[PDB]
């Protein structure tokens, strides 16, 4: 790792930017995503933010899904998580 003389700033390695700060990447990108949380029962289509801040509910039993924390929302053990993307 002599210095950037060996790497190319234009085409940097695709995994080293998976670890840098989002602002400090070559092009700024969010670190979050949106996920459609599926409860144990029906009504499995609700969409929630990864770094959510509001305690979302469900139409059935209000089925508390996530708790807001300092980072990613604390999903419950009973709620299944899969992610939706662009």
């Amino acid at each position: 790792m002599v210095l950037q003389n060996d790497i190319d700033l234009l085409n940097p390695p695709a995994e080293l930017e998976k670890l840098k700060h989002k602002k400090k990447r070559l092009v700024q990108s969010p670190n979050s995503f949106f996920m459609d949380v599926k409860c144990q029962g029906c009504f499995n289509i609700t969409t929630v933010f990864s770094h959510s801040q509001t305690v979302v509910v469900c139409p059935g039993c209000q089925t508390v899904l996530c708790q807001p924390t300092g980072g990613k929302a604390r999903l419950t053990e009973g709620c299944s998580f899969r992610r939706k993307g662009d």
Binding site: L3, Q4, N5, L9, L10, L26, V27
Partner: protein, 129 residues
């Protein structure tokens, strides 16, 4: 605060050049920075450089070829006529044989020899040699 992005660009480029780097990154980019780099490249003091669109202000990645000794801005942008260029040449340049002063004349951004050719004056952006 960032009061002159041209100074930051030129200073980062010069610092990278002294350390023997082959590429340098400039952030944020701007049109005047691009024109200064275009003049420097046309005279053969740098090489390739590419602008990267980050949708906010853009970055520049510049390829160095080791030919640039010094490059730096002049602040504040003093106004020089065609008759004063010689004087500034005696101040900012090593010798009359080479070196360049960049002027932002109303005909665009150019070097001082081109300004004398077109017989136009303007403000002084920086210098490089």
């Amino acid at each position: 605060v960032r009061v002159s992005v041209l100074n930051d660009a030129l200073k980062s480029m010069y610092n990278a050049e002294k350390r023997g780097k082959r590429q340098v990154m400039i952030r944020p980019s701007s049109k005047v920075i691009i024109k200064f780099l275009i003049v420097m490249q046309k005279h053969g003091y740098i090489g390739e450089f590419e602008y990267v669109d980050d949708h906010r202000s853009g970055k520049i990645v510049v390829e160095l070829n080791g030919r640039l000794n010094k490059c730096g801005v002049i602040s504040p942008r003093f106004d020089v006529g065609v008759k004063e260029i010689e004087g500034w040449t005696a101040r900012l340049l090593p010798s009359r044989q080479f070196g360049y002063i960049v002027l932002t004349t109303s005909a665009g951004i150019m070097d001082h020899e081109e300004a004398r050719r077109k017989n136009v004056g303007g403000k002084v952006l920086g210098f490089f040699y």
